[PDB]
Design a protein around this nucleic acid. Sequence first.
DNA 1: GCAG
DNA 2: CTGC
DNA 3: GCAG
DNA 4: CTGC
DNA 5: GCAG
DNA 6: CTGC
DNA 7: GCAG
DNA 8: CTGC
DNA 9: GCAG
DNA 10: CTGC
Lengths: 161, 161, 161, 161, 161
Amino acid sequence: TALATLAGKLAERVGMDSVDPQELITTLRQTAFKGDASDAQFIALLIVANQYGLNPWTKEIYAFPDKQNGIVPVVGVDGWSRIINENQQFDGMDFEQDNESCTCRIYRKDRNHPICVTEWMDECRREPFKITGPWQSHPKRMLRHKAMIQCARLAFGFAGI
Amino acid sequence: TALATLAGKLAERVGMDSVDPQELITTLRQTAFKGDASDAQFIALLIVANQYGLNPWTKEIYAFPDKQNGIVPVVGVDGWSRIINENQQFDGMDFEQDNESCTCRIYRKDRNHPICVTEWMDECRREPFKITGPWQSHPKRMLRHKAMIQCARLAFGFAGI
Amino acid sequence: TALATLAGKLAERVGMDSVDPQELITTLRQTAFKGDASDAQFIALLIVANQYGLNPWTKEIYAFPDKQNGIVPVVGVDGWSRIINENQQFDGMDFEQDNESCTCRIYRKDRNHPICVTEWMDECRREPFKITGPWQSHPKRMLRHKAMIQCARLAFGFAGI
Amino acid sequence: TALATLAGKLAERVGMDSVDPQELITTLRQTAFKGDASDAQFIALLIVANQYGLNPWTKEIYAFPDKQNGIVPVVGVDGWSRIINENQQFDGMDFEQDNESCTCRIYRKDRNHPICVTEWMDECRREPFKITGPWQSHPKRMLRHKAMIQCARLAFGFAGI
Amino acid sequence: TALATLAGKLAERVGMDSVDPQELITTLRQTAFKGDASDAQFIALLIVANQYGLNPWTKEIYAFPDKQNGIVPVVGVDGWSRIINENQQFDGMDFEQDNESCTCRIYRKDRNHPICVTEWMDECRREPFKITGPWQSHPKRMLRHKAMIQCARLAFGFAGI
DNA sequence: GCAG
DNA sequence: CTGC
DNA sequence: GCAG
DNA sequence: CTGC
DNA sequence: GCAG
DNA sequence: CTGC
DNA sequence: GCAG
DNA sequence: CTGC
DNA sequence: GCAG
DNA sequence: CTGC
């Protein structure tokens, strides 16, 4: 039942009145939950994403199905990129990199002291699946994503969201 | 049903009253979704593009059909080019390039510290399909597109859109 | 009974009216309480998390089932990251690390004297379970989490929350 | 009788109306009083914790059952960490440590003279139970907890709480 | 009779309406008076603690049953720690220690001259009972408690309480 | 990763 | 012209 | 740990 | 393409 | 002690 | 993947 | 003396 | 995992 | 003299 | 665990 009013209201938002809900629900469920996902897991992702204050369609927040029908949420690089950019006290940021590490420093206008975090590649890197992943094809970008996330967890966090 | 009122209303916007909807729907579906695409995937692209705040006809945002009838969205260089240009706090940008890297730095009026990102060609470049692509015929432009996108993800993101 | 109104109200918050509560309750219970958990233990986690002033869905606070049907609460790195960031008197922080220790110093605007704490790896590190954990794959990050928590216990604590 | 209205009111505080009180009371009793505890000992912990001005669910204050059905209260490191942090005259603190001692000095804004206390490990350390405790696995942290408590007993105490 | 209204009112202070008073009275009597104590001795401790201006539940003041049914009051280290900390004229304190003595000096804002007292271990120390006491396991702390008490008797006393 |  |  |  |  |  |  |  |  |  |  409830997924048909969600699919309908979302369609009505783009002016697409009177869709067949079943093919649309299925399409949308496989968009946010890539892979198999009970409707109970799909509606759980919608309420959890609202608790974080983040948008699932935009891929600001992911989730994957747990063993025994729970879910596991995962805030992405775009979720943290929202959180630091819609706060008025942010004052810019800078980075440093080499063959093995990345450093990221965040400044804010009210706080006198910048906050700085350093990440390390050989603990962040992942082995090839099975086969080729982004940790094989793009390593120097993939580490800089991780160092920004870890700094924004401390400089801002979820406080005020 | 709903695609015929979409095709009709869009036509009525250019003063083309009383079109035959079936040939127009087909034409329009193959414009935004290049290649085969269920109507459920086509109406999903319309609602997702509205969630990002971007226009599909203008190619600010693409999508491709997933395996098992989902979709995958892709914000293009014109989507980020909109997002940084319709924000009042943007204060210009500069670039640096060589045989192997591109750097892009974005300034904003309220933030004291510029934000700067660097991209690398030999991880961004793609192998020839099958046959000749833009990563064969235009490499020095194709990298500069990637470095602008990656910087605009951090300097602005989706915050306030 | 009471879990069905909780699951319902939470769904109504995301606009998902008239869900089947049983599959949703089960999904949600296994999200916050990973593993087996009586409904009496699940409702105990909800009231305890409110007493700390922290959110369970966001993983700011965990709990695990005790022997003889109690529970054990555990404030996480995101719980302390909230608490120091939603307080107006925080004035930034800095860190120091090596092969064996981490130091963290917290400043505040009203207090003249910074507060500083040091942690040590060979007492904080954990042995492999059974098999590979984060204390095997990520040690230099895992220690820095512990040193921030221990400092924030003294510089702020639960005073005013 | 009275425990069912306590369990009920606490549940009503998290919006969980109409719980079965018996499983909840049992769960809660085993949370605050770990181990066996008469209801008369459980309600005694609630009134004593109010006299100190501290919260039992948060583990700011513990108690254990006496021989002949009394109780013994124990203010924890988080109880003293509350008491020094919710007082306006606190002005920061500093520490010193070595192989055998810890010193802690507390400053306050109105008092001209700081107050300083020193603790010693070989009198504070405890022998292994029966088997491995925190006085085996974490000694350098476990002593620093004791030195802060002992200083805060003199610099603030219970005056004004 | 009177103990049931005391136990009741105290419970009503923590919101525990309609307790069985007999098990609660017994629990509370054995908390403040550890060991056997007539109800006449228990109500005598309550009125005497009010005359000193100190709280019995908090262990600011102890008592023990006399031979021939009197009582003996004993102000503790927390009773003196209250008395010097809730007085506005206190101006901090300092200590000196060695193998055999402890010195404590108290300053106050209105009085020009600090007051200083010295204690000695071999007269303060106690022999083992029967078996191991705090005068065996913690001697350097146990003496510093005695030197603070003796100084606070002269620098403040009960004047104005 | 989708640009020409 | 491609998507784990 | 989820990015391309 | 993965989750203790 | 619970993070990835 | 763990809790005296 | 109760912390992890 | 402990309390004279 | 009663603290842990 | 103690009180002349």
